[PDB]
Amino acid sequence: ILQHPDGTVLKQLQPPPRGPRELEFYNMVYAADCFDGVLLELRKYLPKYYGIWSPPTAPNDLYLKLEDVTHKFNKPCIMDVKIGQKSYDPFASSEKIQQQVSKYPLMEEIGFLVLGMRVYHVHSDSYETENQHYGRSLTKETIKDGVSRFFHNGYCLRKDAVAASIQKIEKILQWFENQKQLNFYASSLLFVYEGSSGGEVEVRMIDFAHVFPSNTIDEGYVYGLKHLISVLRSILDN
Numbered sequence: 001i002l003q004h005p006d007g008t009v010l011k012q013l014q015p016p017p018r019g020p021r022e023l024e025f026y027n028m029v030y031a032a033d034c035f036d037g038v039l040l041e042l043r044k045y046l047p048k049y050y051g052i053w054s055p056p057t058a059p060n061d062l063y064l065k066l067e068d069v070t071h072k073f074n075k076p077c078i079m080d081v082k083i084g085q086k087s088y089d090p091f092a093s094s095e096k097i098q099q100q101v102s103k104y105p106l107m108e109e110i111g112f113l114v115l116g117m118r119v120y121h122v123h124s125d126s127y128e129t130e131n132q133h134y135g136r137s138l139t140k141e142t143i144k145d146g147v148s149r150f151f152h153n154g155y156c157l158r159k160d161a162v163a164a165s166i167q168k169i170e171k172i173l174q175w176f177e178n179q180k181q182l183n184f185y186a187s188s189l190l191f192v193y194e195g196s197s198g199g200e201v202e203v204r205m206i207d208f209a210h211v212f213p214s215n216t217i218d219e220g221y222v223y224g225l226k227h228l229i230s231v232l233r234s235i236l237d238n
């Protein structure tokens with residue numbers, strides 16, 4: 001992810017088939033002649049899409065030009081959470097499934113995985129960062145405290161941001177419960193709140209290299225959202 005001063009990010013397409021698939025996802029959603037109510041509503045929850053981009057001198061080098069969801073914040077606190085019970089897709093090989101489940105074997109049980117967070121601390125004027133190993137270390141016993149960490153500025157628990165996060169996730173859940181045409185594997189929610197202008201929060205869906213047509217509710221994604229909501233709700237009682 002490359003941040004551009006103009007309030008956009010450039011995401012380099014992943015190798016095939018992942019990058020092409022994400023391009024076609026955005027292209028389908030933001031299709032100019034799209035009157036599909038499901039896809040029109042979904043746009044609210046994605047980064048705004050500015051189409052494919054490549055350097056003037058390098059047509060080979062493919063990027064998606066996307067809204068930088070963090071742009072409007074002064075000291076953005078950012079958390080990326082992978083959603084779902086399965087991070088492999090319906091066409092994965094046996095080896096691929098094993099690879100994906102081994103990366104985090106609690107995915108079925110918990111239904112989400114914290115990919116990372118960056119938290120601004122007021123008293124130190126500094127950021128705490130957690131990498132992929134943080135979230136992959138979390139269990140049923142430690143997931144609540146693991147998530148809570150995102151909302152600690154080093155003096156208070158930001159229950160305002162927690163409550164706002166629940167409310168915005170709920171709208172995404174409502175979208176999922178009113179569509180049976182897309183299933184999303186290994187996709188994420190990006191959480192942003194203001195670390196320095198009170199209860200201001202972004203929660204957006206990102207990373208669409210494994211989105212597939214479906215005839216059914218995305219039960220795994222729904223489960224993940226429900227559990228994440230439940231965890232956030234309990235944090236409100238801290």
Ligand SMILES: O=C(Nc1ccc(-c2onc3ccc(-c4nnn[nH]4)cc23)cc1)C1CC1
Pocket residue numbers: 001003009011047066067068069070078118190206207208
């Ligand atoms: O450590 C940082 N991380 C960070 C900052 C902005 C974003 C971000 O903002 N808008 C975005 C829209 C799509 C995607 C995206 N799609 N697929 N993978 N990422 C990512 C987006 C992500 C991470 C801060 C210091 C820069």
